[PDB]
Design an enzyme around this catalytic site. Sequence first.
Site, PDB file in Angstrom:
ATOM      1  N   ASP A  31     -32.130   4.333  34.981  1.00 38.90           N
ATOM      2  CA  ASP A  31     -32.623   3.205  35.762  1.00 38.90           C
ATOM      3  C   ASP A  31     -32.294   1.881  35.082  1.00 38.90           C
ATOM      4  O   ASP A  31     -32.138   1.817  33.867  1.00 38.90           O
ATOM      5  CB  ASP A  31     -34.129   3.316  35.977  1.00 38.90           C
ATOM      6  N   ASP A  54     -31.981  -4.180  40.901  1.00 35.94           N
ATOM      7  CA  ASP A  54     -32.518  -4.513  42.213  1.00 35.94           C
ATOM      8  C   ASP A  54     -33.965  -4.965  41.989  1.00 35.94           C
ATOM      9  O   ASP A  54     -34.626  -4.499  41.064  1.00 35.94           O
ATOM     10  CB  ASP A  54     -32.456  -3.284  43.123  1.00 35.94           C
ATOM     11  N   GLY A  93     -39.456  -0.296  46.157  1.00 34.39           N
ATOM     12  CA  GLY A  93     -40.600  -1.115  46.506  1.00 34.39           C
ATOM     13  C   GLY A  93     -41.729  -0.278  47.079  1.00 34.39           C
ATOM     14  O   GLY A  93     -42.731  -0.825  47.545  1.00 34.39           O
ATOM     15  N   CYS A 141     -48.584  29.852  38.429  1.00 35.04           N
ATOM     16  CA  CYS A 141     -47.554  29.509  37.444  1.00 35.04           C
ATOM     17  C   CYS A 141     -47.812  30.037  36.029  1.00 35.04           C
ATOM     18  O   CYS A 141     -48.897  30.506  35.711  1.00 35.04           O
ATOM     19  CB  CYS A 141     -47.347  27.993  37.396  1.00 35.04           C
ATOM     20  N   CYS A 154     -51.285  28.534  34.836  1.00 36.36           N
ATOM     21  CA  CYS A 154     -52.468  28.940  35.598  1.00 36.36           C
ATOM     22  C   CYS A 154     -52.727  30.441  35.684  1.00 36.36           C
ATOM     23  O   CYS A 154     -53.876  30.877  35.723  1.00 36.36           O
ATOM     24  CB  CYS A 154     -52.398  28.355  37.011  1.00 36.36           C
ATOM     25  N   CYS A 202     -53.253  28.298  41.632  1.00 34.04           N
ATOM     26  CA  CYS A 202     -51.833  28.418  41.310  1.00 34.04           C
ATOM     27  C   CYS A 202     -51.563  29.682  40.495  1.00 34.04           C
ATOM     28  O   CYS A 202     -52.463  30.209  39.848  1.00 34.04           O
ATOM     29  CB  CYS A 202     -51.400  27.179  40.508  1.00 34.04           C
TER      30      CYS A 202
HETATM   31 ZN   LIG Z   1     -50.118  26.089  37.695  1.00 32.80          ZN
END
Ligand SMILES: [Zn+2]
Lengths: 577, 577
Positions: free
Chosen positions: B90, B125, B191, B276, B279, B274
């Site tokens: 950026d 920008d 923006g 994952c 979790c 979750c």
């Molecule tokens: Zn998770």
Amino acid sequence: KMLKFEIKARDGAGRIGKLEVNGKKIETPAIMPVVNPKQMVVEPKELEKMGFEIIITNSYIIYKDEELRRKALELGIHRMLDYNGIIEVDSGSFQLMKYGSIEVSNREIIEFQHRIGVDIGTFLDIPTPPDAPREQAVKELEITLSRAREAEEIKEIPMNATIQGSTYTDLRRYAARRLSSMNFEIHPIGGVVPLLESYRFRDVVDIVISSKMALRPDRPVHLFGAGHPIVFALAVAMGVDLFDSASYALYAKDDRYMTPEGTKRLDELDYFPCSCPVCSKYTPQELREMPKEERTRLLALHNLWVIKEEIKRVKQAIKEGELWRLVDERARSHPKLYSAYKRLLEHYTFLEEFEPITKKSALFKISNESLRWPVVRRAKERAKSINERFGELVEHPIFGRVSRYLSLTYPFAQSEAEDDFKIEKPTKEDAIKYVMAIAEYQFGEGASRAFDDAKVELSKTGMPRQVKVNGKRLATVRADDGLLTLGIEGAKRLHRVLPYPRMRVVVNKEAEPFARKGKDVFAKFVIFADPGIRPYDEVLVVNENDELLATGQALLSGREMIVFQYGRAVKVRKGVE
Amino acid sequence: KMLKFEIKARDGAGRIGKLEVNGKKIETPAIMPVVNPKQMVVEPKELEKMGFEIIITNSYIIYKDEELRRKALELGIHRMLDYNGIIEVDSGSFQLMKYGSIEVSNREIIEFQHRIGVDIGTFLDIPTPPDAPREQAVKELEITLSRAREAEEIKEIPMNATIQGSTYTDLRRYAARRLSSMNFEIHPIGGVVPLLESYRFRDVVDIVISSKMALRPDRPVHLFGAGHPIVFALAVAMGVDLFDSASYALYAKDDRYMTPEGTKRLDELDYFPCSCPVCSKYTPQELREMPKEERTRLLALHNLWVIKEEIKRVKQAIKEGELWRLVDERARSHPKLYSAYKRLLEHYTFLEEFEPITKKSALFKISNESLRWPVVRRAKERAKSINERFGELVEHPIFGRVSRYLSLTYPFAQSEAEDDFKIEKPTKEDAIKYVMAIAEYQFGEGASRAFDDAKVELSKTGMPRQVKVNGKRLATVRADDGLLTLGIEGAKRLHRVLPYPRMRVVVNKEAEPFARKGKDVFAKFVIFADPGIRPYDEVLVVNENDELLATGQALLSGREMIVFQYGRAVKVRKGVE
Ligand SMILES: [Zn+2]
Ligand SMILES: Nc1nc2[nH]cnc2c(=O)[nH]1
Ligand SMILES: [Mg+2]
Ligand SMILES: [Mg+2]
Ligand SMILES: [Zn+2]
């Protein structure tokens, strides 16, 4: 009493409960994986490691296989499956629904269930199919009830007493009321499997609601065969506490993959929209090329993870008072589920008795349906008289317009829609008008007369808080929901201003001393209570002579308090002593 | 040509794409984790192992720091970050948001990004805030464009040309027009951070659509700052191909847990909704006890898995043609998201242009908004004329009434709502009427005149298939969508019945031979196409003299076939020569 059940948290008609069976404790809503004694896709010990503390098997299948029965009689199902949680077992009723006749008598499998040391048994209830001749639905139900009376006579263990009656709501009510008067610990709702398979969720809703209506509240409800995540949210919102699943394994053997929104064929998957142990490391295009045995295994595990994950999601939503939102989200999974969802909302009267008075989350306007949620319809009606009395209405995105005096109170203030609602704070000359409006709204007609002459204090912000009168605090407006929290003084006033039994919870002579000291009130001691009490209402703890013992917050509805024998009925704030 | 971008699949205005930079390919939708050169909760190599093949860093920060500055110039970000994927950087515009000015020039950073081996750069920008006065939205945009002009001049690397007109759609349009006309390869829309952090999603929809309307379809669009799983499905449906997220880490630092439906505080979580790696392994409480650093790490990773998972969910839905169904499900996460979803559907004209003509998935009535989906409004309008002529209006769950002659074609036939719709099979006499109604509906007014004198040969089932005349097969009604697949002969007839440019795709003189030969038409060789052509429409491959060269099926919209320089535009069924 071998089975104990109590409510710990709730939303809609749903609840998170603590269930204890002969010493084993499990938290509901819960799902028990179905285990095939002949071919266990996932070993019971692994299911247990995954967190499945309850499972179910077919005592009938075991009974018929020479080798299985021999082992079951030799070591007990627990050692046979090498599983330590709660082992529930079915009777063979499912084989009945498929073949009509089974080779074992009701008394026989029941006695067999006892012999193998089963945690929870089930008798030969008959699963009458949907849309069956009323004649058959009745003939079969009566046998079911007869077999039930027999089971009630000989059982020495906790047992399932399943509600049947096909698609006739009047037969459902009858079954529920009858089995509710018998000595049974859990009430499954059967006959629905074909509906679920056909995705006739609307018919299931009708069957489930009519059953819940007639069933006594304090006993767990099990929806037989509802083993697919897509219905969990809806079913739990209706008051279902238990689910069993065989599809996790059967789908896996069919290369079918479960999702909270439905089912998908492995051969139509380009990506795994999941992050479970299986999906986090594998790929659709990989799984598809693996040995079937392996492919079946990984799919089964995945399916179990998604099922476990939905349950947790549902419980977390109940915890935060967002179940309806979740239900609304899942309703968009399929046209039929959407149909069923709208139907469920028509049952406002059933739902309204259990809908908490105040929730953690704010009311979210996320659809047309949300305007029909129980809490919305209730606040509407309760405000009607408060508006024509205090006037000074303001615009509201959801409720149209409501008196400025309720604008700080749930769910008017505690809500959000497409556009934002500007709450109007009180003035020094306004305050009391708010407290009065809230009272009339929270406690019902006449309640304000307990606060008229009071002085409302304002915080660093123009918010109403401490309510006093010639001394001690009568109550306080909560910052979180704009509802009144009663102090002993304010409770005394309400008590003399409102006629018995309004806001009352009548307790045992034995419970009297404890309530006076401020201890919590337990359901088993509640002999009677106002039928209008809703979960989380402020409450007046009283003896039979209607003498104020204490003030607190309800955890159950009036009715539930009477019926329940386990769990707290009221969380006491302060006692008279 | 420093950036290649190809459409691999699509749905709604969304698309799964192939993005290549420096011989590095990536699939979109894609999300790039924002990496802080100073502090890294998770490191690039870890992110690479997790599958994030594109990331983004702040070149300005790297610039302003001696340490990073040296290592950057010395080693080049790739080796510096130990990341081998696409590295985007950026400008420092982000710092402009909060500081208004920075100590570096548009030219300086641009050349610096060139020096450090950045795969994709960005110029300075100006991210004008959401509701700035028009003079400021205008001032800053002109300044932005002058920097765009300077960047286009000296550019020696692919760059992001950010659309920046605050909340004035007319300024967004202009800003897009100008940047599109310039030589850049990716178009972020900026923006918007202040809008996303305030859940003002409706405003983001308006800004995105106005930008997308004026952008060259062939260039990737990036929604700057959209790093929460909550907007993915919605945004992708609007044609947003790239996202960047700093939230996965920042949120973790404040014990905030991401979800496809929103954000949760750790201290408010009773269960992890979750599965994952994190979790499925820990419990909320187990997490709260860990040291802050470990907590932050595990939460950050979880957030990354949710992000990665929603993306795969969005891509799977596109492949299945069920994106809208997902947007709808997701719209229920928040009142502000629901407001944005309904607003998005108001932009029918924009959406309908990119909306495919046929889909594998059935049309599901899962909500009120479901009735306003692009495919539904398009079908209504088009069918009006058919209902006026061929009559025979049969009942339909979604469109209410529709001529029976279209009951076999998409989206009417497969459609499903609260109650199923039954199809009307043709009679050997009505057979022709169907082929004609379909033609009129599929090819527009008058098209029927190309089939009147034809015989429709029904199959084993009363279904219409091959359409022939004198012995030549014009077309064949598909079994799947009930839409006509043209045969060279049908193509010819339609070619003279319908006025140029209807159904036409005009190819180069260099492409003319292949098309005649039967080869597929590639986009770069298309000079002009019928604006009315929609993805999957049947098209007439013609040369500048409007001489039929072949027949095929469109893989892009007419407008897209012109601008696109990569990928196939038409899958040719059969040439002429
Ligand atoms: Zn998770
Ligand atoms: N006992 C019993 N087991 C079942 N399994 C599936 N449905 C049923 C039912 O209705 N009753
Ligand atoms: Mg009681
Ligand atoms: Mg072209
Ligand atoms: Zn999985």
